[PDB]
């Protein structure tokens, strides 16, 4: 609806953006709209890797991370249509949930 909004927390180089078929290396924290945390790669001390263009993540990450450059830290606010929709993720994400992720694009591989 409001799709995905990208708010910069601290800037990346503003020139190295991920293309289709590249692997993005990120650290993230995911919270519900009211701030309760549901997951964080920082809590596991291990960055998350996914490849753009490979249907691996919710649409708000696909479109939101594609807009960031290496080094950038940003807040992604993602509407349910760009997340888990009516189903949610049983026991983790409720139905019809807007999600907020703190995402840092660490590196491209």
């Amino acid at each position: 609806s409001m799709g995905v909004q990208v708010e910069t927390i601290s800037p990346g180089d503003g020139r190295t953006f991920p293309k289709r078929g590249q692997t993005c290396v990120v650290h993230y924290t995911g919270m519900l709209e009211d701030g309760k945390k549901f997951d964080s790669s920082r809590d596991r001390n291990k960055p998350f890797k996914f490849m753009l263009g490979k249907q691996e993540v919710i649409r708000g990450w696909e479109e939101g991370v594609a807009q960031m450059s290496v080094g950038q830290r940003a807040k992604l606010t993602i509407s349910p249509d760009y997340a888990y929709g009516a189903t949610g993720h049983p026991g983790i994400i409720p139905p019809h949930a807007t999600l907020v992720f703190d995402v840092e694009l660490l590196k491209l591989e």
């Binding site: 609806s1 409001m2 799709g3 909004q5 990208v6 708010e7 606010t77």
Partner: protein
């Protein structure tokens, strides 16, 4: 006693404000935060002012309320460059608020 117009617009305003969870539109844009704003934007608008107008029964119609909401978004899209969070939110919220208020 709230008039029917005062009841409906506050209902609409709360729905519109929920679309701005970070409060980007909550208060008037100052020149200290945005130099030259008052030279560029001639008729500033924000949710807080809209709320004040409802409380003071200044809105004669839903039409006028929609016009202030549009003005607020249009001001944001004039002042801020297209690559900013502010510009993108104003365009998104303008479309989404109109859809909600019909």
């Amino acid at each position: 006693e709230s008039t029917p117009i005062q009841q409906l617009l506050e209902h609409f305003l709360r729905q519109l404000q929920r679309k701005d969870p970070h409060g980007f539109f909550a208060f008037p844009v100052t020149d200290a935060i945005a130099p030259g704003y008052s030279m560029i934007i001639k008729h500033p608008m924000d949710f807080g002012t809209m709320k004040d107008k409802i409380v003071a029964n200044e809105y004669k119609s839903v039409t006028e309320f929609k016009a202030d909401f549009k003005l607020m978004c249009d001001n944001a899209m004039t002042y801020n460059r297209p690559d900013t969070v502010y510009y993108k939110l104003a365009k998104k919220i303008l479309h989404a608020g109109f859809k909600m208020m019909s």
